[PDB]
Design a protein around this ligand. Structure first.
Ligand SMILES: [Gd+3]
Ligand SMILES: [Gd+3]
Length: 283
């Protein structure tokens, strides 16, 4: 069904849409700037409208790696490194890998949201794998090693899988499998309802990023409304937007994402092809 493909395309393109939109106001304190509603580009990097950042770049790298050779963390890092060296915590991980050959180069200080911003591709291709959560943890470990970042990635992997399978918003927010689970205290507070309150800003800390995305998803009645709530929190807006985009994209579907946002999106067609290829792979 196109209905099923629509969810996978939505999750992938939603990630990029959130990255591009949020990038326009990243670094700005909440409530100090005009409400973001359109793909105008700009931000600290004077981005053209619809242009995303490293969040989506890493997602693309992971997607190509998966389609090229299944789950291969070594290949993932080869691609990240190559992407990194072609341009001018993660950089430390990439250099660690370059020097030692260890693909799981993340350290305990890496509690950032990097693993969350690029996740979608993994779930699209390995949605039905019995070890999906373990694969997600390994995919996070390549650049981040903090307990809360690894667990936050597992929670997002579960969320995406369930959304792709048609689980209702209430079930996704209930996070039943994680209730009472032995998680890092910060993440436990999120799973137990910390996300119902509006964040003071878009957090860069993994648990906080997930909480901000869940909050926007909980309050937004559709993809667009939730996306605007997410990015207007300011702070790490491109990444909070990217995480929200993945969840909301999988939940609402590509057809629910504002057409003008998709038409302005850089490499829209390339991503749609990748998303479809990954989905075919999961079957
Ligand atoms: Gd960025
Ligand atoms: Gd950022």
């Amino acid at each position: 069904l196109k209905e099923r493909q629509d969810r996978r395309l939505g999750a992938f393109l939603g990630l990029a849409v959130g990255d591009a939109l949020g990038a326009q106001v990243e670094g700005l304190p909440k409530g100090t700037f005009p409400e973001v509603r359109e793909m105008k580009g700009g931000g600290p990097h004077r981005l053209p409208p619809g242009f995303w950042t490293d969040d989506t770049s890493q997602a693309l790298c992971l997607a190509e790696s998966l389609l090229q050779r299944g789950f291969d963390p070594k290949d993932q890092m080869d691609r990240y490194l190559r992407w990194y060296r072609e341009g001018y915590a993660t950089r430390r991980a990439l250099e660690r890998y370059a020097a030692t050959g260890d693909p799981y180069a993340g350290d305990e200080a890496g509690a950032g949201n990097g693993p969350l911003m690029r996740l979608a591709p993994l779930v699209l291709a390995y949605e039905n794998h019995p070890d999906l959560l373990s694969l997600a943890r390994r995919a996070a470990r390549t650049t981040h090693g903090a307990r809360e970042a690894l667990e936050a990635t597992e929670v997002l992997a579960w969320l995406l899988r369930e959304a792709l399978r048609g689980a209702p918003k209430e079930a996704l927010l209930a996070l039943e499998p994680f209730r009472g689970a032995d998680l890092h205290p910060a993440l436990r507070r999120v799973v137990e309802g910390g996300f119902w309150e509006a964040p003071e800003e878009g957090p860069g800390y993994a648990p906080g990023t997930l909480a901000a995305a869940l909050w926007a998803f909980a309050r937004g009645r559709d993809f667009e409304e939730g996306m605007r709530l997410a990015v207007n929190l300011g702070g790490d807006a491109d990444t909070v937007g990217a995480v929200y985009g993945q969840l909301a994209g999988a939940y609402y579907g590509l057809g629910a994402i504002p057409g003008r946002w998709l038409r302005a999106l850089h490499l829209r067609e390339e991503m749609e092809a990748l998303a479809l290829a990954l989905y075919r792979m999961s079957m």
